Amino acid sequence: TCPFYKKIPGTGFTVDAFQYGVVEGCTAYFLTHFHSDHYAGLSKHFTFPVYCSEITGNLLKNKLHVQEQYIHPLPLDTECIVNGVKVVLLDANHCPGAVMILFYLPNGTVILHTGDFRADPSMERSLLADQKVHMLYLDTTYCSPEYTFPSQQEVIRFAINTAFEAVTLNPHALVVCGTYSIGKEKVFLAIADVLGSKVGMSQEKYKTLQCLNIPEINSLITTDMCSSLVHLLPMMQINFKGLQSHLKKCGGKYNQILAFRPTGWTHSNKFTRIADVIPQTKGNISIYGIPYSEHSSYLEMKRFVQWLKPQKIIPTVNVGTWKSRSTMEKYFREWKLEAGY
């Protein structure tokens, strides 16, 4: 049955709630982004109205074959009326097409649902600046002070400089990047750009990227692996066995692999600066785990909440254990006492 934290009080709405069958009293299903834990349950047989971004609606139609008549895409940063309730979609700084949803309830309550997000000071100057928010449904994925990570910009600088050095030293090295969902496209696009190559990938992955409105994409990606020196593979194949096997398939064009796994967090973060990251190496294969996050660090999440000053916080992540729930509730109280709301 649908958990309470996916239901919007005072409305007929649910958020990211497609795996529970017909939710009783739900008149419109919202989808924050195209990640499988959130869309689980959608297909060509869904016949209720789904509300989402334009990019998410491209993916629903082309990848899951949802019929057009049931997809209701909304423009960002624009006041819209859904089943009699004002809503606004905001950029969530997560993966392409990901949104936060502002609900303006008929009784005067204002609710923000962050979906999955990576908090940023640029959010402090959207339509959020313009009114009070009473209830926050918060992506608490990394809600503990051990979770620090570098900016995305620092991580991309490291990856470009590492790849450019390796291929300039050895023009016969191949660069491989792992993927299993949309998101983190900057990693592989930035590396292909510095090298003067397209990114090569499977037809299924090319199709998915063609749904994303990324400018000049026909210029950066391809299904012709032979013409590319940056290849995308499934995340599961980024290990020594999988990479040895791939290198065999390339027919002696290449004699070394440099591979990247963009993880969220790993405990090497508590000790090591980005500058200091080193790969795991076996023979002519090296694998780098880089801390490229599309979720808030602890400090980014704290700053957002202390700026927004909500009256009530509802976590949406790590809610399954009493220890996790009590840990989060204790940080929420700290933040409120320190800031004075």
List residues binding Ni ion (CB under 5 A): 35, 116
Q: What's the distance, CA 99 to chain centroid?
A: 10
Which of 118, 205 has the CB closer to Ni ion?
A: 118
CB of 34 to Ni ion, least distance (A): 9
How does DSSP classify residue 237?
G
Nearer to Ni ion, 6 or 35 (CB): 35
Cβ-based nearer residue to Ni ion, 116 or 300: 116
Q: From the centroid of its chain, how far is CA 204?
A: 19
Query: Residue 284 Cβ, how far from Ni ion at the closest point, in Å?
Result: 35
Among the listed residues 165, 178, 119, the one whose alpha carbon sits nearest the alpha carbon of residue 301: 119
Burial of 221: CB neighbours in 10 Å, binned 0-12, 13-18, 19+: buried
d(CA 7, CA 266): 32
Least Cβ distance, residue 184 to Ni ion (angstroms):
11
Q: Which is nearer to Ni ion, 298 or 335 (CB)?
A: 298
Going by C-alpha positions, the residue among 62, 44, 7 that lies closest to residue 29 is: 7
Per DSSP, the three-state class of 174 is strand
DSSP-H helix ranges across the chain: 36-39, 54-62, 152-169, 185-195, 203-210, 240-249, 298-308, 322-339
CB of 9 to Ni ion, least distance (A): 24
In the complex, the smallest distance separating the C-beta of residue 139 from Ni ion, rounded to whole angstroms, is 8
C-beta neighbour count of 40 within 10 angstroms = 12
Q: 35 or 261, CB closer to Ni ion?
A: 35
- Give whichever of 261 and 294 is closer to Ni ion, judged by the CB atom: 294
Least distance (Å) from Ni ion to the CB of residue 240?
29
Dist. CA 142–CA 315, nearest whole Å: 11
For Ni ion, the closer of residues 78 and 181 by Cβ is 181
- Cα separation, 52 vs 99, whole angstroms: 8
* Nearest to 61, CA basis, from 97, 87, 25: 97
CB 115, min distance to Ni ion, A = 8
Specify the residue, 29 or 116, whose C-beta has the smaller distance to Ni ion.
116
Q: How far is the CB of 191 from Ni ion (least distance, A)?
A: 23
Q: How far apart are CA 15 and CA 51, in angstroms?
A: 10
Q: Give min distance, CB of 35 to Ni ion, in A.
A: 4
Q: Are 55 and 96 in contact (CB under 8 A)?
A: yes
Instruction: Assess contact for 213 and 55: CB atoms under 8 A.
Output: yes
The smaller minimum CB distance to Ni ion, of residues 66 and 92, is found at 92
Largest Cα–Cα distance in the chain?
Answer: 68
